[PDB]
Structures are given as C-alpha cells and as structure tokens.
DNA sequence: CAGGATGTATATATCTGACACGTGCCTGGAGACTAGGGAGTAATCCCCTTGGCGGTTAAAACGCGGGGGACAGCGCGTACGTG
DNA sequence: ACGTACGCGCTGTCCCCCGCGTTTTAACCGCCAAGGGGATTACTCCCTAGTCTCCAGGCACGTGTCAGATATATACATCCTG
C-alpha cells in the first residue's frame, strides 16, 4: 500500500508550543451595464492598472535580472502606460477572434490565437 | 553684414541650422549637402503642420482650448493617411478611439 | 518519415 | 514580494478589457492575462536593465524604458 | 527641444488654441522620431548607391518610402519649395 | 454497382499536403507570374526592364507571404471549429496582424 | 501594354500554395479573394522596389533592389544577391 | 618584422581585419576601438558555426552530403531560439517545416 | 570587378564542424547574406548604444550590450562567453 | 405602447497650479575663404534583357456525383454579471 | 446571492467542393539576335569640411493672469417591466 505522509508531527499544531512550527427591486439585464462600462472607459484616458501594485510588480521582475535596482518614478509610469496599451490591443484582437468564433465571451483560446496569429509568440 | 538665419532665409520656421548640425553629428554620412537640411526642415514642418492641424480641430469640437495628449490620439487614429505612419507607436495618455463591434450592441 | 531531421540535440554544446 | 502578479486584480483586468471592447469576459482570462503581462515585462525590463547596466548606472530611468520599448517595435512617445 | 519651434507653428495654424506641456513632449518626441527614420533611411539609401554624401535628392527619395500616400505628394511638394526659395537668395 | 474506387473526400488533400510541405519547388507558375509583375510595374513607371533574378526574388517572397497567410488563416478556420477556410478568415488573419 | 494578368495566377496554383500552408478544404471564394491580397502585396514591394531604381537613375530594376524593398517592409530575404 | 594576421592572434576563423574596416566604412561611429572587431568576428564566427553544425546534422539524416537551403530551413525552424532570432527572415528555396494541425488528420 | 564576400570563411568553419560535408552555392549565398544581416544588426545596435550614452566611439563592451539584446536566450550567454574568450586571447597575445 | 429611474450630459460658480509671456544670458550658428576630393560629364562595349519560333507535353479548365461538412435550429444549465 | 444568456452539444438538412476522368491550352525549352543600358576610366570642376571670429536666438528661470479642474445642482436620456 502507499501511504502519503503527515507533514507536521505534533497534536498541538504548535499554536500552543513555543518556537512554533506553525505559530512563528430594480436590476439591469445582463450586458446593459457592460456597454455603459465601455463608453465610460473608452472615453477616458486615466490609468487603469492600480499603481502601487504595479510598482511592486516591476521591482519583483527586476530582481532576477539585477539586484538593488532603483527605478525613477517616471520609469515606472513609462512601463505602465506601455503595458496597459499592450493589453488593450490584445483584448481588441481577442474580441475580434471571439466575434469570429461566433460567441461573445473572450476565452484563453482567443487569447492564445490572437497571440499566435500576431507572430509575437 | 548682418547675419540672417538659414531658417528665416528659407521662410521656414523649423531650425535649418539645428537640423543641419544634427545631420552631421549623427554619423549618417561623411558629408551632408547644403540643400539636404533645408529640404528636411520643410518635410518636418508639414508633418507637424498637419498633426497640429487635425488636433487643433479636436480642441474646438471638444471645447477645450488647450491641446492635451488625447487630442493627439484623436487626430492620428481618425486619419488613415497618418495612422499608417504611426502604426507601431503608442501615445501615452492617449486612450483609444471609441468603438464597439456590431454583434456586441443589443 | 522519409524526410526527417529527428531533432537529435537542441540544447547548446559550446 | 513573493506573489505580486496576484496583485493585478480581477477588476483590474476586467477594467482593461472593458476599454478594449469586450462584453463578457470568461473566468479563465483573469488568470491567463497575468501570464501574458508577465512575459511582456520580462522582455521589456530585461532590455531596459541592459541599457542601464551598460552605462554603469544603477537606476533604470525612463530614457531607458523608452529605448527598450523601441526595439520591441512598441515605440513610446512623451518621455524622450 | 523642438518645442519652441512647434509652438511657432501652432500659433500660426491656430492663432487661439494652446498646447499642453505634455503635447509638446509628444511632438518633441515625435519630430525626433520622424527625423531619425528619414535621416536614417537617407543614410542607408546613399550606402546602397555607393554615394558618400547625403544630398537634397536623397532625402526626397527617403520620404516617398516612409510617408504613405497623400502625405508623400504634399511633403515633397513642400520640400521643393524650401530648396528653391533658399537657392533663390 | 459499378464502383470506380474513389478515395474518400479528404484523403487526397492530406496526401498532397504531405507531398508539398516535403517538397520545395516553386508553386505559382513562373511565366504567368512574370507577366503579372511586368504589368504592375508598368503602372508606377512605364518602360521598365526587369533583371531576371529580380523577378525571381519577388516570386520567392510572394509565395512565402501567401503561405504565411494560409498557415495563419487556417488557425482562424480551425478556431470556429470548422475545417474549410473561407474569406471571412483571410479578412481576419490580416487584421489581427495589424497589417490590414 | 499588359492587361488582365492577375487571373493568370491559376486557380490550382492557389491551392498548391494552400496545401503547403496546411489547409485541407478550401471554399469557393478564397481563389478570387487571394488574388486581391497578393496584388496588394506587390504594389507595395514593387513600388518601394521601383523607387530605388529611379533613384540611382538606372532603368533596370536590379535584383539587389527587391531585397531592399523587402528589408524595409519587414520581410527580409536571404540568398538573392545578398 | 614578420607579418602575423590579426585573425590568427585572435584564433578566430572569420577575418577580424575585414570587419575592422567595415565598421569604419559603414559610418557606425566616429571612432572604432581595437577591441570591437576581434569581438565582433567571434560572435559572427560563433553563429555561423551554429547554423552549420545544425544544418550538417540535418543533411546526414536526409542521406545527402552537401548542405542545401532546404537543410538550412530545417536547421533554423526546428530550433526554438535561432527561429526567434530569424523570426522575420524568409529563406529562399527554403520550403516549409512539415506541420499538420491535429484536427485535420482523418479518423 | 570584385565583390568581396564571406564565401571563404563560412566554408572554412564548415570543415571544422563537419570534416566531410560541403556546401552548395545557393546555400552559401544564404550564409553570405545571413552574416551580412547579423553584422548589420549588432553593429547597427552598438552604434545607437554609443550615441545614446554620448560616447563617441564604439568599443567591445558596447558590443556585449549589443549582443545581449539581439541574440535571444541561450545564445546570449554563449556568444559573449565566446567573444571575451577571443578578445582576452588577443590582447594577451599582442 | 406608458411610464418611473436611472446616468450622463449640462450649467453656474469657485478656486488654482500651470502654461504663456518677460527678461537676462551665453553658446551655437552665421559670415568669410579656401582645397582637394567627391561628383558629374563623354565614349564604349559587351553582355544580357526583350523579343520572336516552333515542338510538346505538363498542366489548367471543364464536367458530374455524392459525401461530408456548413449552417440553421433547439434544449439546456451553468458560469457568467449584477448588486 | 441569484437568475438567466449564452456556449455548447445534439439533430437535421442540403449545397458545394473534392475526387477523378476528359479536353483544351499555353508554359517550357532550346534557340537565335539585337541593341540597350549598366558598367568602366578621363577629365574637370565646384562644393562642403574645416577653420576663425563675432553676436543674437534658444534656453533657463521668474512670474502672473487664467482657462481648466472641481463641487454642486437641473435636463433630458435610456431601461426596464408591465
């Protein structure tokens, strides 16, 4: 027989043991708001990706290329305004691929195709 | 003899001299002809004298006298003859032209 | 199968 | 900073694609988009760092990212 | 800094409209890119033809490759005016 | 009765797919191509003469552009779950690339 | 003067390509449609090709020219001329 | 003094001299260091010593001694990183890499 | 009437890595045009590098930064490890 | 069709931080003068595209069945959007 | 949490494209030529790089009205859900 294992060997769970291992009406029909959300966005230019969660995403990527980098607060923007656009283009292409496949909801099949056809794979 | 700028002598507004010095130092070629920069100054004007034109109209039709980077993104993505010149380039703070496919609309 | 490279070894051997 | 790609939220992607033009976004996108965005930055940064690492600087300044983006073909405007 | 030059144009084509301090950046970043593409193509074009010096004719031919369609017509129509006006004096 | 032993619809094409991808010669017929290029350039500047290779260089690129198109319109036709490609795909696979 | 050559690209020559591409069944409209695309692709390459030929003042479109017009658009070519 | 070719001292096969001129003639910069050519011939000589050994090992498998473009097209598209370097390139007389989508295959 | 080329060199390397194989013309004029492509990207890259940093000249380092951008993946870590091994041998032998 | 509820668009007024103009400044550009090296200009020649000739056969066009995929319809149940 | 629109799987229908003979055709090959234009030199010339000297246009900084952001509070606009 094959027996997995137990990961941790105590009944207390170390919560009670010091130096713990484990303790230190009205509704819109579907879709009608979607379109209202588009015209409210395609008319605006404000950045969509939240900034401070992006800053911490760029830093994490830079580490395994070089250590102790310091980004100018401008060069975190110039990345964001690029990677926002890259995605908005990708989503237009996937929307085209889905309108093609005759369904409305984009899906990872659509993402992967809109990348393969671009040759940017 | 009072000095007259090449840009003013040619009647243009862009700096013939500054374009000329740029053409030399960029290491494009060993020598740059006398008539090369003046021609390139004019070609630079007409490309700004058209993007600033189309964007200039965007301000009026949008009722904001100052041109903000979106008014650029509407001047170029509307015009096909320009869009192909600006195919790959992204404009920061530009947004996207507003459209929705026919199948989506109810 | 009549025309094949069979991809003997891909990773670099410097 | 163990997992920050989980920081780009579900409404973050949903907001983006809403600008893109979609209507209904299937659930598996919200994860799959992160896979694309990640492999985009790993290419843009790895170039931006190299320009930096060359000039001996220790700061990836905007004039670098604009350059790294340019070779990608995704020319960027407004910074230099 | 092509910005003073850009303003002079805008104040000509639109005597009332103003320009934000970010658009100038777009244009100063834009003109430089078009200039680089053209002058870069011009250099490669002289190299193919074994010519040593970039001249007036090299830039004109360099334009008709980049600018699409109607722009190629009026740009080279504008360029020839400048050289003839410059060569007039 | 009377059966000519016709292969199943679908297995001649796969066969000849396996025959062309293996091979490497030129597909678009040489001379009727040359009479096309001479006809296109006759529009942009009259009375040109084409060097021999310069016609070949085109056909070598014009093929490997279309083949790059079909191998990319097919992915669009597989996508709608059907096999037969159709002009509503080459209209797609050219707009995805952005080349339009 | 030359006329009506695009229909010279024979209908099989469209499938013979498409085979090498990797498609199995081809609809009826593709044939008439593909010519429309290939004609667009030549008026691009040939033009850029002609412009160089005009530039050096040489009448004959050099094989080396076409390699350049392609190199500009983004489809480099190897082996012809160099 | 006896002449020792600069391509010998580097140990390279490609010519370092001929490159060192090409950098000057192509107008890539106003001055060219003496380290650039030696370093630039190596990279070239490395890559050209990559496509070949791959092409060769493709030739032997088709039972032909000589290398022909069809072998090169097979050596480059198979490899994942060389293909990414030559992504846009189109090789003359190259043919295609055999690929059939799985949906089309009969059943 | 001389059009200088890399036909001698590519052929010399081919004997190093396949002492039996030989290369046909139409396959050579590919390699003779592949090198002239790479050497026009690498150099053309370390021409903008020097210009950006405002250094006037082009030196080897500017080529490492030029290689590690074009050559994708494992090639970048092998080329520059093959470049330095050359240039180090050169200076030490001069 | 009739009608409330909703969201965006619209008006009036209130600040500001920000772009337009002023002013001083110094650094790049304009003037002026060569020098030789690149560029244009004239035979020439030869080799190399265009052009025609005829056989010939590989291939394109054409014809017909029917076999299978394109497409339309439908039932549905769940993975979506909405709050 | 919920309620329902849609992706999808199934059935059914039919048209249209693949398969394979026939029948027509024009690509191809090889062959000859002619003259056209791209490729040498000679020559001569004139144009831009290089250099020196002087100065004013572009740049940076200062500031100061001011058009745009912002808050608030109507006027229709669509959207359902009968």
From TrEMBL, chain E:
<dbReference type="GO" id="GO:0046982">
    <property type="term" value="F:protein heterodimerization activity"/>
</dbReference>
<keyword id="KW-0007">Acetylation</keyword>
<protein>
    <recommendedName>
        <fullName>Histone H2B</fullName>
    </recommendedName>
</protein>
<comment type="subunit">
    <text>The nucleosome is a histone octamer containing two molecules each of H2A, H2B, H3 and H4 assembled in one H3-H4 heterotetramer and two H2A-H2B heterodimers. The octamer wraps approximately 147 bp of DNA.</text>
</comment>
<keyword id="KW-0158">Chromosome</keyword>
<feature type="domain" description="Core Histone H2A/H2B/H3">
    <location>
        <begin position="1"/>
        <end position="65"/>
    </location>
</feature>
<comment type="similarity">
    <text>Belongs to the histone H2B family.</text>
</comment>
<dbReference type="GO" id="GO:0030527">
    <property type="term" value="F:structural constituent of chromatin"/>
</dbReference>
<dbReference type="GO" id="GO:0005634">
    <property type="term" value="C:nucleus"/>
</dbReference>
<keyword id="KW-0539">Nucleus</keyword>
<keyword id="KW-0544">Nucleosome core</keyword>
<keyword id="KW-0832">Ubl conjugation</keyword>
TrEMBL record, chain F:
<comment type="subunit">
    <text>The nucleosome is a histone octamer containing two molecules each of H2A, H2B, H3 and H4 assembled in one H3-H4 heterotetramer and two H2A-H2B heterodimers. The octamer wraps approximately 147 bp of DNA.</text>
</comment>
<dbReference type="GO" id="GO:0005634">
    <property type="term" value="C:nucleus"/>
</dbReference>
<keyword id="KW-0158">Chromosome</keyword>
<keyword id="KW-0007">Acetylation</keyword>
<keyword id="KW-0013">ADP-ribosylation</keyword>
<protein>
    <recommendedName>
        <fullName>Histone H3</fullName>
    </recommendedName>
</protein>
<dbReference type="GO" id="GO:0046982">
    <property type="term" value="F:protein heterodimerization activity"/>
</dbReference>
<feature type="domain" description="Core Histone H2A/H2B/H3">
    <location>
        <begin position="9"/>
        <end position="96"/>
    </location>
</feature>
<keyword id="KW-0832">Ubl conjugation</keyword>
<keyword id="KW-0539">Nucleus</keyword>
<keyword id="KW-0379">Hydroxylation</keyword>
<keyword id="KW-0544">Nucleosome core</keyword>
Automatic annotation (TrEMBL), chain G:
<dbReference type="GO" id="GO:0000786">
    <property type="term" value="C:nucleosome"/>
</dbReference>
<keyword id="KW-0832">Ubl conjugation</keyword>
<keyword id="KW-0488">Methylation</keyword>
<comment type="subunit">
    <text>The nucleosome is a histone octamer containing two molecules each of H2A, H2B, H3 and H4 assembled in one H3-H4 heterotetramer and two H2A-H2B heterodimers. The octamer wraps approximately 147 bp of DNA.</text>
</comment>
<keyword id="KW-0007">Acetylation</keyword>
<keyword id="KW-0597">Phosphoprotein</keyword>
<keyword id="KW-1017">Isopeptide bond</keyword>
<dbReference type="GO" id="GO:0030527">
    <property type="term" value="F:structural constituent of chromatin"/>
</dbReference>
<protein>
    <recommendedName>
        <fullName>Histone H4</fullName>
    </recommendedName>
</protein>
<dbReference type="GO" id="GO:0005634">
    <property type="term" value="C:nucleus"/>
</dbReference>
<dbReference type="GO" id="GO:0003677">
    <property type="term" value="F:DNA binding"/>
</dbReference>
<keyword id="KW-0164">Citrullination</keyword>
Automatic annotation (TrEMBL), chain H:
<dbReference type="GO" id="GO:0030527">
    <property type="term" value="F:structural constituent of chromatin"/>
</dbReference>
<dbReference type="GO" id="GO:0031507">
    <property type="term" value="P:heterochromatin formation"/>
</dbReference>
<feature type="domain" description="Histone H2A C-terminal">
    <location>
        <begin position="80"/>
        <end position="107"/>
    </location>
</feature>
<keyword id="KW-0238">DNA-binding</keyword>
<comment type="function">
    <text>Core component of nucleosome. Nucleosomes wrap and compact DNA into chromatin, limiting DNA accessibility to the cellular machineries which require DNA as a template. Histones thereby play a central role in transcription regulation, DNA repair, DNA replication and chromosomal stability. DNA accessibility is regulated via a complex set of post-translational modifications of histones, also called histone code, and nucleosome remodeling.</text>
</comment>
<feature type="domain" description="Core Histone H2A/H2B/H3">
    <location>
        <begin position="1"/>
        <end position="77"/>
    </location>
</feature>
<keyword id="KW-0597">Phosphoprotein</keyword>
<comment type="subunit">
    <text>The nucleosome is a histone octamer containing two molecules each of H2A, H2B, H3 and H4 assembled in one H3-H4 heterotetramer and two H2A-H2B heterodimers. The octamer wraps approximately 147 bp of DNA.</text>
</comment>
<keyword id="KW-0832">Ubl conjugation</keyword>
<keyword id="KW-0539">Nucleus</keyword>
<dbReference type="GO" id="GO:0000786">
    <property type="term" value="C:nucleosome"/>
</dbReference>
<comment type="similarity">
    <text>Belongs to the histone H2A family.</text>
</comment>
């Amino acid at each position: 027989a094959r027996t997995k294992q137990t990961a941790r060997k105590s009944t207390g769970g170390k919560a009670p043991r010091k130096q713990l291992a484990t303790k230190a009406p009205h509704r819109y029909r579907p879709g009608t708001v979607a379109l209202r959300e588009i015209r409210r966005y395609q008319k605006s230019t404000e950045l969509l990706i939240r900034k401070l969660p992006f800053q911490r995403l760029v830093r994490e990527i830079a580490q395994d290329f070089k250590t102790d980098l310091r980004f100018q607060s401008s060069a975190v923007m110039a990345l964001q305004e690029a990677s926002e656009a890259y995605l908005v283009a990708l989503f237009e292409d996937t929307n085209l691929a889905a309108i093609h496949a005759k369904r409305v909801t984009i899906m990872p099949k659509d993402i992967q195709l809109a990348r393969r056809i671009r040759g940017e794979r | 003899a009072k000095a007259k700028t090449r840009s003013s002598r040619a009647g243009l507004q862009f700096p013939v001299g500054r374009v000329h010095r740029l053409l030399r130092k960029g290491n494009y070629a060993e020598r740059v002809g006398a008539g090369a920069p003046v021609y390139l100054a004019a070609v630079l004007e007409y490309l700004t004298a058209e993007i600033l034109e189309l964007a200039g109209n965007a301000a009026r039709d949008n009722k904001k006298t100052r041109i903000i980077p979106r008014h650029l993104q509407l001047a170029v993505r509307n015009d096909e003859e320009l869009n192909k010149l600006l195919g790959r380039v992204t404009i920061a703070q530009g947004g996207v032209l507003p459209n929705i496919q026919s199948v989506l609309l109810p | 199968r009549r025309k094949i490279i069979t991809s003997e070894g891909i990773e670099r051997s410097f | 900073l163990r997992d920050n790609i989980q920081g780009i939220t579900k409404p973050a992607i949903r907001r983006l694609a809403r600008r893109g033009g979609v209507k209904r976004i299937s659930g598996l996108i919200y994860e799959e988009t992160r896979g694309v965005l990640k492999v985009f930055l790993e290419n843009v940064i790895r170039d931006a760092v190299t320009y930096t690492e060359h000039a001996k600087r220790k700061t990836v300044t905007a004039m670098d990212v604009v350059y790294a983006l340019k070779r990608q073909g995704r020319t960027l405007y407004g910074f230099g | 800094s092509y910005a003073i030059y850009v303003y002079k144009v805008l104040k000509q084509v639109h005597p009332d409209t103003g320009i934000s301090s970010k658009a100038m950046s777009i244009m100063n970043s834009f003109v430089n890119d078009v200039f680089e593409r053209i002058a870069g193509e011009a250099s490669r074009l002289a190299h193919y033809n074994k010519r040593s010096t970039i001249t007036s004719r090299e830039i004109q031919t360099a334009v008709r490759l980049l600018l699409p369609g109607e722009l190629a017509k009026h740009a080279v129509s504008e360029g020839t005016k400048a050289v003839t006006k410059y060569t007039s004096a």
